[PDB]
Design a protein around this ligand. Sequence first.
Ligand SMILES: Cc1cc2nc3c(=O)[nH]c(=O)nc-3n(C[C@H](O)[C@H](O)[C@H](O)COP(=O)(O)O)c2cc1C
Ligand SMILES: Cc1c(C(=O)Nc2c(F)c(F)c(-c3ccccc3)c(F)c2F)c(O)nn1C
Ligand SMILES: O=C(O)c1cc(=O)[nH]c(=O)[nH]1
Ligand SMILES: [Cl-]
Ligand SMILES: [Cl-]
Ligand SMILES: [Cl-]
Length: 348
Amino acid sequence: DERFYAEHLMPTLQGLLDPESAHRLAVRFTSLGLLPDSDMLEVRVLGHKFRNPVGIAAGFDKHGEAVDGLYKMGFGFVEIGSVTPKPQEGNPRPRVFRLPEDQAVINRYGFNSHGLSVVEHRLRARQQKQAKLTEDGLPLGVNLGKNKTSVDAAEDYAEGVRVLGPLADYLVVNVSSPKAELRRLLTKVLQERDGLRRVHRPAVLVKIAPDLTSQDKEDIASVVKELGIDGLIVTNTTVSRPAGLQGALRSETGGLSGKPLRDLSTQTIREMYALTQGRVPIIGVGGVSSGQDALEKIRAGASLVQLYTALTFWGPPVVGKVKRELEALLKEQGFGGVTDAIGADHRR
Ligand SMILES: Cc1cc2nc3c(=O)[nH]c(=O)nc-3n(C[C@H](O)[C@H](O)[C@H](O)COP(=O)(O)O)c2cc1C
Ligand SMILES: Cc1c(C(=O)Nc2c(F)c(F)c(-c3ccccc3)c(F)c2F)c(O)nn1C
Ligand SMILES: O=C(O)c1cc(=O)[nH]c(=O)[nH]1
Ligand SMILES: [Cl-]
Ligand SMILES: [Cl-]
Ligand SMILES: [Cl-]
């Protein structure tokens, strides 16, 4: 199955369809269930149980259309979004580009979004089914964005907390799509979160870019610890273009994802974990396509990982591949389970 998808099915789909069409078709098949975990992999973090540490990253299911199909694919948690307060169309097409020679993607969707109300009703339609999933170790995250024309960014995020916070196990404030300002924004987000009833009160995480200065990262770490933010997601796509990219489309505007981002992300995880003294959970994301990629991020300080771009090259079988390879490496390196490996590089 893994070799069939990787060598025949996916490159044939890649040859027939532009990338955005292929993505919409993938969302449709996934939402319909048309698709091909040991105790070692279980993680307790963010007030929840995660049956395995491999999640689908924000951007694949922007509108909350495919959540149950994504669990069926084998992900330990699903993050939907980003969702903006009002519906908006995003940038003109084409707005996403494959770099097959680099195992990379560049995108400038621009927060195309069905908007909070539509996503609210979509998640309400399965709210009790989610409550059982979460209880069974399959939590749901909701990533919040802001409309293009908004004047008050904090009020857009506050709206998302009030509308989708009650349906989420965790919320993501994505201030990273391609110090006192951040403190102001996050104080307002956390106040809105704390005003939700306890059974409907999610964890709040901040998702950051890999393109931050050292000053930026220091200031983020300080605010996150000061305010009691529950976690970090590290990282979004990069607006850098590392030397060595071969794809003809490498100079398209947008955020770069996939293998060229991987170690830039891992190093950002490493720094943020050290700057927060290992006390702030990190979801690590960027260029994960194997168990080794996942364990490097875990050893660098991630309690959980996500992927997206690998799914677009290798198809659904990549999820089970990453999990199988991660379990094998954990045993080889003598860890009793994922939990013991979190942050392990910092104890050498
Ligand atoms: C097509 C595409 C769309 C994305 N949209 C978003 C988004 O709406 N919100 C967000 O926080 N990140 C989004 N991302 C970033 C991913 O969540 C992730 O941080 C990044 O792609 C690195 O992971 P990867 O290398 O495994 O793809 C998007 C990524 C891609 C490739
Ligand atoms: C976002 C994206 C995809 C994408 O998502 N492709 C894709 C996928 F991510 C899938 F997961 C499947 C799939 C295959 C079988 C069953 C269910 C889903 C698929 F066909 C796909 F094209 C792609 O090829 N390019 N870009 C930018
Ligand atoms: O354009 C988008 O919607 C988008 C792209 C991306 O790479 N990251 C993000 O947060 N939003
Ligand atoms: Cl459009
Ligand atoms: Cl393309
Ligand atoms: Cl509710």
